[PDB]
């Protein structure tokens, strides 16, 4: 839980699954807060939920580029999510 945020499981009928997160996705940011470790993510989700933020942008990574397209510039991974209600004990739905 102090390892890099590498998604393993995708919880069924959850936010993460509905907005379409796949196994292997590496979340690097949320709104904001730099995500390096799982701790930073947990903290950020709670902060945002109590801040009253209902929706925000989740940035991740998926796969390596094709050869001769290493240095290519494109949108990182703009993906808008609903923030889980921590009061109602709601989860995002990801686990290593």
């Amino acid at each position, epitope marked *: 839980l102090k390892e890099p945020v590498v998604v393993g499981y995708v919880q069924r009928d959850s936010i993460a699954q509905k907005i379409g997160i796949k196994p292997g996705d590496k979340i690097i940011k949320i709104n904001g807060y730099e995500v390096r470790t799982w701790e930073d993510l947990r903290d950020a989700l709670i902060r945002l939920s109590l801040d009253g933020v209902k929706e925000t942008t989740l940035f991740l990574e998926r796969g390596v580029a094709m050869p001769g397209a290493e240095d290519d*510039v494109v949108e990182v991974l703009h993906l808008t999510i609903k923030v889980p209600n921590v009061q109602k004990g709601e989860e995002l739905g990801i686990a290593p």
Partner: antibody, heavy 117, light 110 residues
């Protein structure tokens, strides 16, 4: 206005030099890497060469024996494919392409290259 | 390192659905992205599907891409097939190099 225009193709004798051009326009040239793909009647699509956006590295196909060399000229927003030691197998339609990280988003019209005596 | 396998030709009726297959030889299908290109007889290839399943706004909705993990293959589903689909459909992926498919050649009966 995304366009990729090929040129410099036609006819050449086996084991000789020929340089293909591919002028690009209507997008930041130095932001995206370039490529080349040929299409014969039989083989179909078959990747040849790819340069990076920064032009730090170049990549080639397995059906080339390090004979061709891919360059780019950001000044004229053009990229080139020099070809040496050609053969009758190399006779194909040569499309140039534009990369977008994980695929070829745009292709050119293609130019005919024929190797014969 | 790997290669892809496509049907040399396929046929379908006007209004029918069709599944064009693309089977990988070695490696995990999902680890490296898979893309799909249409090409009419004597035309430049155009993007049907990229990043596995993502369709570029412009291509009809009836087209769709998928990743069948069981067969280590990619598939292209075309609902309510039209006459304008009379074209070759190549699949594409990469790793250390860049690979294309054999070339599926769709025909439209009716």
């Amino acid at each position: 206005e995304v366009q990729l225009v090929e040129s410099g193709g036609g006819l050449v004798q086996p084991g000789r030099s020929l340089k293909l051009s591919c002028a690009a326009s209507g997008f930041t040239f130095s932001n995206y890497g370039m490529a080349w793909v040929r299409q014969t009647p039989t083989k179909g699509l078959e990747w040849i060469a790819s340069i990076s956006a920064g032009g730090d590295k170049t990549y080639y196909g397995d059906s080339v024996k390090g004979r061709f060399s891919i360059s780019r000229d950001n000044a004229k927003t053009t990229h080139y494919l020099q070809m040496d030691s050609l053969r009758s197998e190399d006779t194909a339609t040569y499309y140039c392409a534009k990369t977008s990280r994980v695929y070829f988003d745009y292709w050119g019209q293609g130019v005919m290259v024929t190797v014969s005596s | 390192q790997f290669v892809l396998t496509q049907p040399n030709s396929v046929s379908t009726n006007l209004g029918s659905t069709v599944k064009l297959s693309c089977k990988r030889s070695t490696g995990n299908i999902g680890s490296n992205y898979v893309n799909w290109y249409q090409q009419h007889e004597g035309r430049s290839p155009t993007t049907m599907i990229y990043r596995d399943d993502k369709r570029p706004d412009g291509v009809p909705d009836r087209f769709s891409g998928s990743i069948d993990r069981s067969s280590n293959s990619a598939l292209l589903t075309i609902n309510n097939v039209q006459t304008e689909d009379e074209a070759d459909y190549f699949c594409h992926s990469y790793s250390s190099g860049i690979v294309f498919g054999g070339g599926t050649k769709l025909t439209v009966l009716g």
